[PDB]
Design a protein around this nucleic acid. Structure first.
Ligand SMILES: Nc1ncnc2c1ncn2[C@@H]1O[C@H](COP(=O)(O)OP(=O)(O)O)[C@@H](O)[C@H]1O
Ligand SMILES: Nc1ncnc2c1ncn2[C@@H]1O[C@H](COP(=O)(O)OP(=O)(O)O)[C@@H](O)[C@H]1O
Ligand code: ALF
Ligand code: ALF
Ligand SMILES: [Mg+2]
Ligand SMILES: [Mg+2]
Lengths: 133, 448, 448
DNA sequence: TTTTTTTTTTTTT
């Protein structure tokens, strides 16, 4: 899954969190374990320029630290630019998931009571992102 | 139970793709039709799509939904959600050709299966039909299957089509004023008069006895081609390391005694020349060397394809030499192995539309004759080397055999075969010290 | 049940990325193969992926699903759901190269374990196999795995890379003031001038008619090389016993009539000379002699490597002579057997980076001519002897053929071939009594 | 078991 890889990239490269757009605009329950990712970004933004060890030290007393440590150990990539590119395209993938979930809901509402011209027109516009390539 | 073949997902993709880009409409239309689908609603959608296209309406979700709603088939095919899902599962519109090709294949198989069922039905119940009639129906059905293909296999072609293509080729050759060199420039004007350059899709061959200049001449052709065009040239050196080849090239281009280069006893001027040569080569950067040993025909084709794909095509490829390649499948019979290699090299040239220069060795029977110039039937192990080749050039240096020869340092390029063109001899000065063949400026001796 | 070493996660990443992108197929094709994958389902998918790619078709879930369905492997791999699941799980394909490498590493390690199991099983059940059979089997497998791990270097290289390496080497030789001694020092002034010593990675050939001075000249090269360097020199005397070889060399170095040594009729002064020679030889101790008969090319390679590994490299190798080696597999076709021997010797020279001097023999056709100087095409059974050799030296003593010859006691070394360098003739003085060739101090005659 | 094509060495007219 692309969720576990995100935190692994997050923990191994803390500075990547700096360029992460806000996520509070969306319900964290939409993705599994999404709230923690947003927790890390604000934590990084709380003290910009933080060491990798310090980032994990922020949650020393928490139980989820074990998952963070395992992800740090897994997928160790010496190159930094590649990791940044992987994080960036991954962040796009999550945005695709959000739009994908939205259109699935909009399909569900269509079955409930149908849709108007604006709604189906908006759905049509919602397929370009899922087929941008 | 047996389910007739079909690809619902491919049917979804072809329907989905065209709604974004309609430029590929002809590609889908010519390849497949609404009869190819296995699901009826998809047939309805495509029939509507074709109608809208014929009416000039752009192919899109809104137009399709409007047409279906007006015709009342929207409910049968689904709706906004169903049609939206159609485009949702499309991986990429550019691939639509493969999806269309898949759909055609599924329809063809379904057509064949139906024919088989029809044949079985007719056979089981004669219904008053005699044995001969049953044969006729099978023949007619088989012919229809071979007829519905719409070529796809390059069957016999009428002469009117061939004439139109050939005359077009001649007319365009007229416009470009190359004046003799239709193919790659060899670099030796006396050689261009006969060969007219190295034509694409050719299997050229350079043969001679050991230490006659076979690799020295081929490298001169490669150097001249690289400096006289812009496409990459690929070298397969199965006999020598890349360093030795480059040491010769520096000696040839910079005209410095290759003994000094190999030994390191270079002066200031020699360093100046070599620096000049290095600058030129690094400015172009269109020569690739692969010194791996014992390559099979498959490895040669794969590597050449990659270079062509990455750099926009090849201009020439050289192999050194033919007999060192291996075909592990055919290792018990050396004659079959060599025939397979030669066929593969000819096929590769056609595929990439590039001239292939493959060197070859010669038999020892040449050395038992009073006259020691090579002939076509001297190529070593050569079952089909003489038959597949379109041009064969032999290198002969008379000074090697007769010490008191008058042709001291005058090599001869004997053209032993040329499918489309004359044959003859060309004389070139041989400067071994520089590892070079030069134009023979001396008086021209008429060839007999 | 010890867990075999494998990594499913790397395989899943590789397969998913290839689904995402098609431009990296080459990146993985070189690195991994279908056999590399652990689980059979992955092996089936890769085989189908390769079949689609070599067909020049796009790679996608729909195409793969149909292709696997065609062969009936769709259900076996796990159904279309598994492929859809795998495509879903893969974010991108940036680090596929690393994933490809680990997958390659796992297979090699698994290959290593299997070989270890096979050797252990064979030892437990010899099935009549002797210790030699087991040792040869163990050596063969370790070599095979070693070769397998050494296939990565292959691939065409640009000219910028080759130019940098070549110029670097030329700079090195320029710094060293060796003054013509680039390889091993032959010990003769004229020979060094025409060849610049014996170069590493070469296959030199010494040929002549029976009883011409062929083993006498080769031993002189071995002696002179041994005293002019510090690396071991290895000798393979398939013809004569080591005692007879040492008897000759003790006569040549000490300049004592070898008849006296052979029959033991020496004097005090002769005993003084032999004592001096023995002291010098034992001071260096860098000559090894192997007089086993009928060795195969594998045995020659195996023994050469052991010497190189123990003493840190070999400075020269001598084989006496080429046609006495054996290749049991090609025991029917003599011509192919000799061709395989020549190919192996050249490969051995390249691997160790050492000059390999191999003696050969000439044909009887030479003796039916008016002129009896050797030529290249006289090498016996020479399928490829004259083709692979980088340098060929013939020994000619006119005295043997013309009893009134003015060239009494003078030997001609005829350089019949030299891939990188000129050719010509060199004259030495032959002292049969001492089994020695001395550089010719008499008047020098120009070479035509 | 038979037919084919390529190498290399000998002996005879
Ligand atoms: N420095 C030199 N001076 C004179 N001749 C040379 C020199 N270097 C190489 N040659 C000659 O160039 C000839 C061609 O070599 P090469 O192209 O390797 O032959 P092939 O590739 O046909 O076996 C050889 O016969 C060799 O004698
Ligand atoms: N004591 C001697 N006096 C004169 N000639 C000798 C003496 N010992 C050896 N020779 C000659 O040295 C020649 C070279 O022998 P050798 O190198 O073994 O021949 P091959 O080239 O077959 O190895 C022989 O032909 C022999 O006549
Ligand atoms: F030495 Al060659 F062809 F005989 F390269
Ligand atoms: F005695 Al020989 F070749 F004739 F070693
Ligand atoms: Mg060559
Ligand atoms: Mg001998």
């Amino acid at each position: 899954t692309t969720m576990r890889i995100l935190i692994g990239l997050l923990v191994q490269n803390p500075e990547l969190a700096t360029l992460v757009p806000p996520l509070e605009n969306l319900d964290e329950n939409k993705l599994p374990g999404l709230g923690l990712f947003r927790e890390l970004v604000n934590t990084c933004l709380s003290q910009p320029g933080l060491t990798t060890g310090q980032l994990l030290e922020h949650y020393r007393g928490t139980n989820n630290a074990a998952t963070l440590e395992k992800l740090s150990m897994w997928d160790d990539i010496a190159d930094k630019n590649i990791a940044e590119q992987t994080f960036t395209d991954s962040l796009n993938h999550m945005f695709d998931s959000l739009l994908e979930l939205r259109q699935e809901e909009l399909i569900a509402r269509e079955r409930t009571h149908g849709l108007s011209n604006e709604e189906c027109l908006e759905l049509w516009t919602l397929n370009q992102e899922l087929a941008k390539k | 139970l047996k389910v007739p073949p079909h690809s619902i997902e491919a049917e979804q993709s072809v329907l989905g793709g065209l709604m974004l880009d309609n430029e590929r409409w002809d590609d889908v239309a010519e390849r497949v039709v609404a009869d190819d689908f296995y699901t009826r609603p998809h047939r309805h959608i495509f029939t509507e799509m074709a109608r809208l296209q014929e009416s000039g309406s752009p192919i899109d979700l809104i137009t399709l939904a409007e047409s279906l709603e007006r015709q009342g088939q929207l409910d049968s095919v689904g709706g906004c959600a169903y049609l939206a899902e159609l485009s949702k599962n499309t991986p990429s519109a550019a691939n639509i050709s493969a999806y269309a090709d898949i759909v055609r294949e599924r329809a063809v198989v379904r057509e064949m299966i139906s024919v088989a069922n029809e044949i079985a039905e007719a056979g089981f119940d004669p219904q008053g039909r005699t044995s001969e009639d049953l044969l006729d129906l099978a023949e007619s059905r088989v012919f229809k299957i071979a007829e519905s293909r719409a070529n796809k296999d390059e069957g016999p072609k009428n002469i009117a089509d061939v004439l139109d293509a050939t005359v077009a080729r001649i007319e365009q050759l007229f416009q470009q004023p190359h004046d003799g060199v239709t193919g790659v420039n060899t670099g030796y004007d006396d050689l261009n008069k006969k060969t007219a350059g190295l034509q694409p899709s050719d299997l050229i061959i350079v043969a001679a006895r050991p230490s006659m200049g076979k690799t020295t001449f081929a490298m001169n052709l490669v150097e001249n081609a690289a400096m006289l065009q812009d496409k990459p040239v690929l070298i397969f050196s199965l006999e020598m390391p890349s360093e030795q080849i480059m040491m010769r090239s520096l000696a040839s281009l910079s005209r410095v005694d290759q003994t000094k280069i190999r030994t390191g006893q270079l002066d200031d001027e020699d360093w100046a020349r070599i620096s000049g040569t290095m600058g030129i080569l690094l400015e172009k950067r269109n020569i690739y060397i692969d010194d791996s040993s014992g390559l099979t025909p498959t490895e040669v084709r794969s590597r050449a394809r990659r270079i062509a794909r990455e750099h926009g095509g090849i201009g020439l490829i050289m192999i050194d030499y033919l007999q060192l390649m291996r075909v592990p499948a055919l290792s018990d019979n050396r004659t079959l192995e060599i025939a397979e290699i030669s066929r593969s090299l000819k096929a590769l040239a056609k595929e990439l539309n590039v001239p292939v220069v493959a060197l070859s060795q010669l038999n020892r029977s040449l050395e038992q004759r009073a006259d020691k110039r090579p002939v076509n039937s001297d190529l070593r192990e050569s079952g089909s080397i003489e038959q597949d080749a379109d041009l064969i050039m032999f290198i002969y240096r008379d000074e090697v055999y007769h010490e008191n020869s008058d042709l001291k340092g005058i090599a001869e390029i004997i053209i032993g075969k040329q499918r489309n063109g004359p044959i003859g001899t060309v004389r070139l000065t041989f400067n071994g010290q520089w590892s070079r063949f030069d134009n023979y400026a001396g008086p021209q001796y008429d060839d007999e």
